[PDB]
Design a protein around this ligand. Structure first.
Ligand SMILES: [Zn+2]
Lengths: 751, 463
C-alpha cells in the first residue's frame, strides 16, 4: 500500500488531495464533506479513530485528568486486543499509540465532544469492526465519564467521519476546531496513511440491569443527604422530576453549601448521570453504574496491561520492578495487584488495599488466563538484572522495553556503562592474562581461534551440537579461564561434577539434569581419568544424550521432565578421555582445545625450562586468582566476549568438531584410512595379490588377516581395540575358520 | 428456581465437561479436550461459556464464589464415565481433527465428538497439504535417494512405506521393524522427517526398556508410552562387544501385545494401552539371547543401501560394500529439519501411503528371512521332519539306510544326528543353539538310549 494520499469525500462526492482539500475548505467554510473510503477492498488499511460525546461541561482540570485516564485505558485495551488476536507486540502498540495523537474539540460550551485519531498506529477496517464488542465492554465497564461516553458506532462498512472545520449540518453552526501541536489538515484524517519509521501496523430502562429500588438507594447514598421530593420518583418520572435536596450538609459532589437550582438524573449507556442545572461548572458530574462487578473490572484492567501472563508449562510469570519474576511456591500475583494500583483510577485503588479483595481480583485473573505463551524465545539477548543487553547491536534496554522479551532468567548483577569501557588498564591486564593462557603464535593460531569460538558461545540461548574438551597439562591455569567466564556470565554459568559422565544421563532424580534448564554454560573439571584400571570409561550414552536440544529429567517430588537445552558443555582435565563405545556420531561430535602454556614459579622454572609438558613456560603469580575472584575484569572480558561473538556468529554459526587431537579416536581413524568394507569386477587383481573371492565375497583366513595386519599396526598398543573391532565386525562360518571381510587400503593402492 | 442450578444444567447440556475412566475431568476449552488435574478448568469454562446465556443469568458468573458453586453442581451432576480417544482413523491437531478416511480436517463442535485428548501440539491450516506443491517433489527426491525406486528395491521399499504409514494408524501393531544400515545412512533423516511430520505423538528412546526387565518394578519407562502413535528405539547396544547385554524375547512379546503391564512410579494403574509401532535403528547385527518359533512372528527387517557422504571422502565411500550409492552431504537439511519446512509434504506422503495400503487394513507382516541368525533356527527344522504316519510305515526300509526302529518310530543315534547336522550347519558358531534345539526336541526312551523322533528330509526324498 505504502500509504494513501487521496481523500474521498461525500457531500451528503469527490476525491481530493491534502492541498486540494485545504484550498476547498478555505474557499467554502460551510461546505459539509464526510471523509470515507474510496474503495473498501483496495486500501482497507486506515488509522485508528474514536468519537466521544458527553452532554455536559467540564473545567480544565477535570477534562485534563479524564483525558489522561481515557488515553491510558484505551491504549492498554487496544494493545491487549492486538496482542491476543492480531499477534502484535503489546509494548510496541502502547508506544505507538501514546507517542502522538490528534485531538479535536467542540466549539459548544454546553457539551464535550471530539474525534481522536492515533497518528502512528495503522490497521485494517476489519480489525476496527472486530474491536466492536471489546470496546463496548470497555465503555460499559468504567467510571470515567469520557470513557463511558465512547460511541461504539462508526465501525461499519463504508463509514464516514465529519472533517475538521466543516459544519456537520447547514443549520448547526458548531464546528470542531483543531488543537496544538498538529495544526495541519492532514493530521486529522483517518484515511491519510503515512507509514514511516515510528509507526506500527497489525491486522487479524432495560430490566436486564438491576432492580429499580437498588438503583434509587445507590443514588440516595451518593447524594448523602435525603431527598426532599422523595417517594415521588418512579419508572415513569425517571428523567423528568428534579431532585430537590435539603442543604443540611454541603453537597458531596460540589462541596458547596448551596446552589441556584437542584440536580437531575439521566440514563445513558446503562448508567445514571447526575448533574446540576443552570451553571454547569457549579457541580461536577456523578456517574452510577447499573451492572457488573467492581472487582471484575479491576481484574480486566490489570490483565490487559500484559503483565501477568502464564508460561507454556503452567507458571504465572509476573512483571514486578522491571523483571519477569515467577515462583511456584509463593505465587506473586497479589504482589503485582498491590504494586500496580498506582496506574489505576482513584476509585480502583482503594479496593486493592484489603487482602481479601486482592484474592478475589486474583481468582478472576487466574480464570481469565486460558492459553499460554512462550518464554525466552530470542537467543541473541543477554538478560541483566535491570534490563536486556542486545548482542547483535550492543545497545542496552532498560525498563518496560525489556518487557518485550520474556526473559525468565538473569545474570544476577546490574549493568553499568561506566565500567563497560574499551580502553582501560583492566582491559590490557586481561588481554595479557589471556595471552599468557593462550599465546597468539602462528602455531597456536587454529587452536586459539577454536578457544575463542568455544568461549564466546556462552552468550547464546540456542542449542549447540558439540562438547569441546579443554586438554592441557597442570599449571596451565584453566581455572583462571573458568573464573573469568563465571564472573562475566553471572549465575547463568554452572559448574557440575563428573556425575553425568559416568552414570546414566536421565536415570533417576539428577540435580544437574534440572539445572541444565536455561543455563547458558556447564563446566566440568578434574575428570576421573580412565587410564588407570578400575575407573569407568566416559559414558558414550551420556555424551550422545547431552547433545539433543531437549533435556528429559525429573527431580525428587516433581512431575515436569521437559527442559529447554541451551548450555554449552565444556570438560577440562589433563587426561585423555576414554569412551568404551565408539561410533561415527561420536567421532563427529567431539572437539578438543589444546593448552600449551606453563605458568610456573621461578623456583621450578629451570625444571620447566626443558619440560616437554608445554610449548612455553613463564613465571606465575599468586596475586591474579584473587583478582579474578574479585570480578576485576568482568566487563572488559564481557566486551571481549561480545566482540568475539560478533566476529564469529555469521548468519549461522556452528560448532565444528576436531577429531584429530584425541589419541583414542586416532586408532579408529587409522583403521578407517587403512581398511574399509570390501568391487565385484576386480577378481584378477585380488588373485594376483594372493587374496581369494568366494560366494561373491572376497575373504581371507583369520590367521592370514592377523599376519597381514601385524606389520601395519602395533598389536601390543591396541590389542584389546583390535579384538573388539573384530568381534563387532565378526561374520564367522565359511571354510574351516571364521569369516573376515575388509580391504587393505595400503595393499589395495599397491598393484 | 435457584439460578445457579439452571446455569449448571445449561452448561452440562452442551456436553463440554466429561468424566473419564482415570477419574479426571476433560473440558472443551479452546478447541481441545484440556484433560488436566492440577488447575481444574471447570471455572475457566464457566467464565468462557458466559455470553451464550441470557442476560440475567450471565451477570452472576463474575463472582468466584458463584463460579465455584456452579462447578460443585456440575461435579455432583456428572455421575457416569465415558471412554477416552477410541477412534483409530483420526488425527487430532491442536486446531481440530483430521479424518484420514476421507482426509477431511475440521474443528469446533464437529470435532467435539471424537474425545481425542493427546494431540500433535500445533495447528493445521492446509497451507500446502496438496500434491501440486514443488515441496512434494523436493521431498520425493530425498525419498528416492534414501530408497531408490529400482525394481529390485520393491519389497524393501514396500516395507519402508508400510512401516512409515503404520505410524498414523491408532490400533495395536504386532510387528517390530528393524532399520539396518551401515552408519546413519539416512536413518536419522527419516527419523527427523517423521518427528517433524506428526510430532508430540513421536517418542524417541535408546535401548533401556528394550533390554532390561519390563515389569516386576516401578519401571516408569514402559508406562511413559501411552497413546503415543510412534516409538523409535535407536542405537542398539551392539550385542557383539564382549559382554554387551542381550535383549529379552519376553520384552519384545510384551511390547507387541495389545496391552502393556507396567506399574508407574508409586502408582497402582499398571494397565496401559498400546498404539505404537516398535521401530529399531541398528548399526550392527541383531543377536538375541533366546530365539524361539514365537519370536519368528514378531520381527520385520528394513535395509538401507545409500550412505550420506561428502566429496571430501567420496572415493573412500565408493569403495565400501556397505553402501550401494553415495550422494554429497547437505548442510541445509539440518536447517529444514530445524524449521519443520517439510511438515505438510511429509504428512501428505504419509496419508497417500496410508490410503494405498489400507485395503482395508494396514496389517504388518514379519519378514524373518533378512535376519542372518534366524535363518538357521528355521532351516534346521526345514532340513528334517518329525516322524509321521507315512514315515512310520517305513519300518526296516528306513533302517536299511542306517536308521533304527523303536516303538514303531524311526530314530537315529545321537552321534549320528550330530554328525548329520554338523555336515550342513555352522557347528562352531551355533553349537549351543544346536544343543538347545536337540534338547528341546530330545526323546528319552531309557537312561542309556537317547533317540530322537526326527528324520532328515534328504533320506525321505531319496528312494
Ligand atoms: Zn454538588
Amino acid at each position: 500500500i505504502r500509504g494513501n494520499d487521496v481523500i474521498f469525500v461525500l457531500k451528503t462526492v469527490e476525491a481530493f488531495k491534502c492541498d486540494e482539500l485545504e484550498r476547498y475548505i478555505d474557499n467554502n467554510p460551510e461546505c459539509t464533506l464526510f471523509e470515507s473510503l474510496r474503495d473498501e477492498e483496495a486500501y482497507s488499511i486506515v488509522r485508528i479513530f474514536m468519537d466521544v460525546d458527553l452532554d455536559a461541561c467540564l473545567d480544565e482540570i477535570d477534562y485534563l485528568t479524564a483525558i489522561q485516564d481515557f488515553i491510558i485505558e484505551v491504549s492498554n485495551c487496544v494493545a491487549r486486543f492486538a496482542f491476543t488476536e492480531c499477534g502484535a507486540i503489546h509494548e510496541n502498540v502502547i508506544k505507538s499509540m501514546r507517542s502522538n495523537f490528534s485531538l479535536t474539540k467542540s466549539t459548544n460550551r454546553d457539551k464535550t465532544s471530539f474525534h481522536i485519531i492515533f497518528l502512528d498506529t495503522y490497521t485494517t477496517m476489519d480489525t476496527l469492526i472486530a474491536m466492536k464488542r471489546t470496546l463496548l465492554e470497555l465503555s460499559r465497564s468504567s467510571e470515567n465519564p469520557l470513557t463511558r461516553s465512547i460511541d461504539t458506532a462508526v465501525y461499519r462498512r463504508k463509514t464516514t467521519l465529519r472533517v475538521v472545520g466543516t459544519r456537520k449540518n447547514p443549520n448547526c453552526d458548531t464546528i470542531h476546531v483543531m488543537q496544538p501541536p498538529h495544526d495541519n489538515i492532514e493530521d486529522y484524517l483517518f484515511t491519510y496513511v503515512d507509514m514511516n519509521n515510528n509507526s506500527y501496523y497489525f491486522s487479524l430502562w432495560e430490566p436486564g440491569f438491576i432492580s429499580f429500588e437498588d438503583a434509587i438507594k445507590r443514588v440516595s447514598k451518593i447524594f448523602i443527604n435525603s431527598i426532599i421530593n422523595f417517594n415521588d420518583l418512579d419508572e415513569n418520572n425517571f428523567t423528568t422530576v428534579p431532585l430537590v435536596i435539603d442543604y443540611v450538609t454541603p453537597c458531596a459532589l460540589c462541596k458547596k453549601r448551596s446552589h441556584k437550582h437542584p440536580h437531575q438524573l439521566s440514563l445513558e449507556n446503562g448508567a445514571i448521570r447526575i448533574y446540576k442545572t443552570g451553571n454547569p461548572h457549579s457541580c461536577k458530574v456523578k456517574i452510577v453504574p447499573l451492572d457488573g462487578n467492581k472487582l471484575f473490572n479491576i481484574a480486566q484492567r490489570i490483565l490487559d496491561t500484559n503483565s501477568v501472563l502464564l508460561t507454556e508449562r503452567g507458571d504465572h510469570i509476573v512483571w514486578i520492578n522491571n523483571s519477569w519474576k515467577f515462583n511456584s511456591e509463593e505465587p506473586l500475583i497479589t504482589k503485582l495487584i498491590l504494586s500496580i494500583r498506582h496506574q489505576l483510577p482513584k476509585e480502583y485503588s482503594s479496593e486493592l488495599l484489603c487482602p481479601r479483595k486482592r484474592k478475589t481480583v486474583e481468582a478472576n485473573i487466574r480464570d481469565m488466563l486460558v492459553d499460554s505463551v512462550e518464554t525466552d524465545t530470542y537467543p541473541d539477548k543477554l538478560p541483566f538484572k535491570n534490563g536486556v543487553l542486545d548482542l547483535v547491536d550492543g545497545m542496552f534496554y532498560s525498563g518496560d522495553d525489556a518487557k518485550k522479551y520474556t526473559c525468565t532468567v538473569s545474570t544476577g548483577f546490574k549493568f553499568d556503562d561506566t565500567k563497560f569501557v574499551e580502553d582501560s588498564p583492566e582491559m590490557e591486564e586481561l588481554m595479557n592474562i589471556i595471552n599468557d593462557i593462550q599465546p597468539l603464535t602462528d602455531e597456536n593460531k587454529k587452536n586459539r581461534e577454536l578457544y575463542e569460538k568455544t568461549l564466546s558461545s556462552c552468550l547464546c540461548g540456542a542449542t549447540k551440537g558439540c562438547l569441546t574438551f579443554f586438554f592441557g597439562e597442570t599449571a596451565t591455569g584453566k581455572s583462571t579461564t573458568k573464573r573469568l567466564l563465571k564472573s562475566a556470565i553471572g549465575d547463568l554459568f554452572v559448574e557440575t561434577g563428573q556425575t553425568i559422565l559416568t552414570d546414566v544421563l536421565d536415570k533417576g532424580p539428577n540435580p544437574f539434569i534440572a539445572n541444565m534448564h536455561l543455563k547458558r554454560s556447564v563446566f566440568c573439571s578434574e575428570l576421573p581419568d580412565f587410564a588407570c584400571s578400575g575407573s569407568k570409561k566416559i559414558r558414550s550414552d551420556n555424551i550422545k544424550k547431552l547433545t539433543e536440544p531437549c533435556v528429559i529429567g525429573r527431580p525428587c517430588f516433581s512431575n515436569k521432565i521437559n527442559n529447554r537445552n541451551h548450555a554449552t558443555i565444556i570438560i577440562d582435565t589433563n587426561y585423555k578421555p576414554v569412551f568404551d563405545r565408539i561410533d561415527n556420531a561420536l567421532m563427529r561430535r567431539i572437539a578438543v582445545v589444546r593448552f600449551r602454556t606453563h605458568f610456573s614459579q621461578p623456583s621450578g622454572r629451570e625444571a620447566a625450562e626443558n619440560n616437554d609438558a608445554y610449548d612455553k613456560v613463564k613465571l606465575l603469580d599468586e596475586g591474579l586468582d584473587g583478582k579474578i575472584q574479585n570480578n576485576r575484569y568482568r566487563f572488559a572480558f564481557l566486551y571481549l566476549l561480545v566482540k568475539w561473538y560478533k566476529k564469529y556468529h555469521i548468519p549461522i554459526m556452528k560448532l565444528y568438531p576436531t577429531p584429530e587431537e584425541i589419541p583414542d579416536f586416532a586408532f579408529y581413524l587409522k583403521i578407517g584410512t587403512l581398511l574399509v568394507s570390501s568391487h565385484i569386477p576386480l577378481m584378477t587383481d585380488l588373485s594376483k595379490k594372493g587374496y581369494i573371492l568366494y560366494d561373491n565375497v572376497v575373504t581371507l583366513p583369520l590367521t592370514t588377516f592377523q599376519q597381514k595386519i601385524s606389520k601395519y599396526f602395533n598389536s601390543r598398543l591396541f590389542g584389546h581395540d583390535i579384538e573388539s573391532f573384530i568381534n563387532r565386525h565378526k561374520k564367522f562360518a565359511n571354510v574351516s575358520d571364521e569369516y573376515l571381510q575388509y580391504i587393505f587400503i595400503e595393499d589395495i593402492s599397491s598393484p
